[model samples]
Target: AQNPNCNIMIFHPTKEEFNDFDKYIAYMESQGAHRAGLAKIIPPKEWKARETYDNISEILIATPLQQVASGRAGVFTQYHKKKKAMTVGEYRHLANSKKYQTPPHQNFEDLERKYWKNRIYNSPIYGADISGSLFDENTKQWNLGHLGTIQDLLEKECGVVIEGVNTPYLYFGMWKTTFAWHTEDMDLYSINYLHLGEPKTWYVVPPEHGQRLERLARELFPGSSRGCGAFLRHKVALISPTVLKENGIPFNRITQEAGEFMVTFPYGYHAGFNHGFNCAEAINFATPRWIDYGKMASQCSCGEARVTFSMDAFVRILQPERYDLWKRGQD
Candidate 1:
């Protein structure tokens, strides 16, 4: 947990360019972000709590889309197809319903108590489809620094752009709304900005330990046959942080508060839940380093077809001349 390489870092807010696109990219790049690292940057003025809430609420409440919410104990969507996995705007509304309310509990130590108390569970409200429209029209913009620039340029270099694979998404969570353990698509890095929230706890497994942890997961679940790990293909297995700790696989945990940005490195397995009612936004990005990993991931059981093909096409188009030479040598 204390390993410097795998630790989750918390950084104080920077007055300069915390909302500035170019500067934020430069900051993330300086952190040697190639590894499985988690960093939190406290919010700047534009990213303060009230503004974030107003902005996010404006869009989510106004927009018309099928927002998905999950349950606390039942089958996580990844594992069972029959589970009721999808919900809409009214469900989102129900999250803050007075009936679900409970008195506040103690800190992290009482997480178990907190877990059972809170009602509705859900993944992020993937409103990236409307993110652009919302930003363009609203006075308050959910500014995503220059990470989008990186994705766009990389896709241009590779000669084909695949939508959605590298795009950002929004999230709203009440207590006990959890994300299962998983890595970003094609081992890509992700940046999550907590627009406004009470506190969201994150548990991260470093890239180096991802595979070993997968093996442990396979043993832990042992469904029907031997499939349970990342290679298990059909199911979304939720590995407990406690289980990981008990097995001696090291991990880092941090409580990400409002206005903080949490960066997850390529191939890191991360999962967490909000402390109370919270809203956050996250997006995925790819560096030049991701190309090789992308190709490898395409072949793995866990890979998504769109991301796999996008990465493959990207490599072929950007370096067609080199690709031809490599192909000839292989033949």
Candidate 2:
């Protein structure tokens, strides 16, 4: 089937629609928003989106060598150049003010089609890490620190707010810095908020097309698959929609602005790059519906080098396995 030309569903939720987080996400899911694998949620006009980052000076930065932009495993240097022991202020200085390869783009599509082809690009930019919990909780109004402990089956079963899965994680992104195509850990749902800064462009393929996308990605990066069944954990692959379409995969594009929330459904493959300097916060939460997916995830290997936290523990806690007592009694 051919994909439509329209953008992913952008939901404008009234206050009542958002009061119950799980219910609202389910409603969005019911609206067939999950057809795109992810959907954008625009908050009410009065939602406070500002949060100070004055104390976040000693920031961590990643050098996305222009290598990965063209579907490579990412190299920070060409063996001659080294690294960045710089701060956020100086990183921005070098990225924007310096005569670097970080060329500007009016439209993200232009960047996607042309950014990697010619000489307008810089070798690498100081893009920050997407994983890591903020030292402090986010602004009270926008915090998902405990978004319906009553809703997230895993969080409730564990009886604690584990970092990354349910806790708020702060991600700093600069122009052209990217997160690769991947699903949430343990195939859980995720909520993303572009707290402040330039727009973030996302490309998502529906769960129905998920396997085709994975197979194509595996073909591109054979080494990643050789290392682990969950190759996306390496986070080094980048592919274009033109390529996905050419390869018979359905995908949707989204331009996420500040103050909006985007929810990614289970088994959804989503990836995107930052249009400019921006800070986005996201968290992962799994509802009871994720039980089947969690069971599937339990059987997959995260590789021997890096041990993943067991999601099977949850499956064990609520076992459907039973003895032969009832059968013998009935007989």
Candidate 3:
């Protein structure tokens, strides 16, 4: 991508993305940060890969939303419980373990229902590492920031939101600069330090605005394969170096870190892409909110993914307290 500083801000040599353990630790120390700026989510994209959009949406919106309303819902619990060093596969296995399970006598249905009921841990930012099992322990770093000083620049200069305090803090390590098709239960707003091989992001309107984002996302890319992407836009703000540049107030370009934007429209459809023909390291967070489980139920009744049920079940076994309350709310 030739490091153009995203065209919104002038590129500087200080933005460091990639680094070793020593460098990461040093950077953390220099930035006055306690731990790595990261979060984990449940059920990898591959877990829901075979499912249709309707199915996935149904589970996330309805079943989970109801549970959240019950005060039993929170982020996935496995990650919080297993905060110590562990591989993605190992963490996933632990999440799937009986230690995290609820009694079989319990009556839970949807994937959302089952998961909240079963989970044995509780922390604002939680979830098992759900990704490929192929990589060895040290080898499988989720593509986050790996270039150079950009990561340090982000830590020192960007708006770094802490985990527990913030809503929807997704800790995807080594992730490329991009987003997948996922709708979070909150409004998004921020200035992003996107560092990837080929950085491309789209938005999905949260509720009423969803239709517009979807239509526009498709038009802009013309069947490129990404839509309704996550964590790359905001609610009620303008973003720089975007297709909507002409629609908002222009900001200073002297510093690339000055970028900011919002996502006000509901059901905003968005996505992103990497220059390397594949995404490697991406990380993001959103202002958290309780999910709208009713939406999931509405989708399920009309027909949704079985995986949704599976995911819900998994969530329950690992975080029973949150799960039970979630199930009750759904009722």
Candidate 4:
């Protein structure tokens, strides 16, 4: 939550470009935004927010209170998690009040001596879907499920509600609540919007450096990697830019403000934390190009539930689009 230098490219889209979700995503892809690992979108300057949100009355969520770390090494693990089913309002208070907090593992420089500070801390839910009163699915720009977005090929063709991927998942966050570094499940593209609240700072490793980043994770945590090879799939580790830079791993940074959007490219590894109390929603989508990633991902041990939804099925359903792309010399 402290570093704030954003050297990432920010795409200022024309109203037409912004409105055509697929076009905007393609433009970014064509220009190598994916090479940088992320596309920071500044919505049309004239846009304004008129919230259409209603907190789900009784939909319970098992929210995690992640234990964060401090000092030079800002790594923390998903290991010692404390979770429980709580209502959104309950989460609101937990984020707001510091009454219940982890005595964050601290490292005052002498980590080899302190013994407690260097644990590499690498580090959901509540569908605010139309049914959840978050936003109207009819709103093209805000609808992550909308077809034609280069990234929305899944549902546009399959009519499947891959919850939390195609379906919007609202988040309630406060200072220091963090998500660890990881790529989207199945290596699909992902988009996140900060509906209202404090800014979120994101660190992304471009697709090119994805393997180096993964190798670094494995090198740093051999025990974890021995089990899965793609152990970061567990989303349990966190490495600061300091560590990343020291290792020659490239990364781009951004501070996403309210009304802004951040779209992650296929295989782009990203992680970030909220600066303060805020509301946000994120969804995963895929461009036709994700087929290669989907095929590769299916062969991995991530074994995340999303992988259970056959990529073969997705490909079978996308045959028409695949043929069309083939006809046009595109994929």
Cα TM-score per model: 0.68, 0.75, 0.24, 0.73
Which residues of candidate 1, in runs, are more than 4 Å off? 1-5, 17-36, 45-52, 55-93, 116-142, 149-151, 155-166, 224-235, 298-331
lDDT of 2 by residue, 131-248 (tens): 5544235444435665653234656664644432335666666666666787875577888888767778888988777888888877877776787676774455677666777788
Better structure of 1 and 2 per TM-score: 2
lDDT string, candidate 1, 178-283, tens digits: 5666777556677787765467788787777777767776666555224312443332445555566678877777888776778787677777766656567676
Instruction: State the lDDT of candidate 4 residue by residue for 1-331, as single tens digits.
Output: 1112323668888766767777778777776677777778888865533445454435455554555453345444544355666766676666556643223434322322222233334222221222122445556564654544433465555466433223556776665566778887668788887877666778898776688888888878777777665667666688877778889988977678888889888888998766656777777777767767765652233343223233444433445344332233211
RMSD of each: 6.8, 7.8, 19.8, 8.4
Candidate 1 TM-score to native:
0.68
Q: What's the lDDT for candidate 4?
A: 0.61
* Residue-by-residue lDDT tens digits, candidate 3, 1-331: 2212212111111223322423533343244221111111122222211222122111111110000111222211011122445433443343344543223433212322333343223222122123222112343222222222222322343344222222112122211122333333222222232221222233332333343443443444342314223212211111223333343312111111111112211223333222111112222222211122212311111111112222343234334455554454334
Poorest 10 consecutive residues of model 1 by lDDT?
Answer: 126-135
Error of 2 at 281 (Å): 0.7
Candidate 3 residue 93 Cα shift, in angstroms, is 32
Tell how far residue 322 is off in model 4, in angstroms.
22
Candidate 2: clashing pairs of residues: 101-122
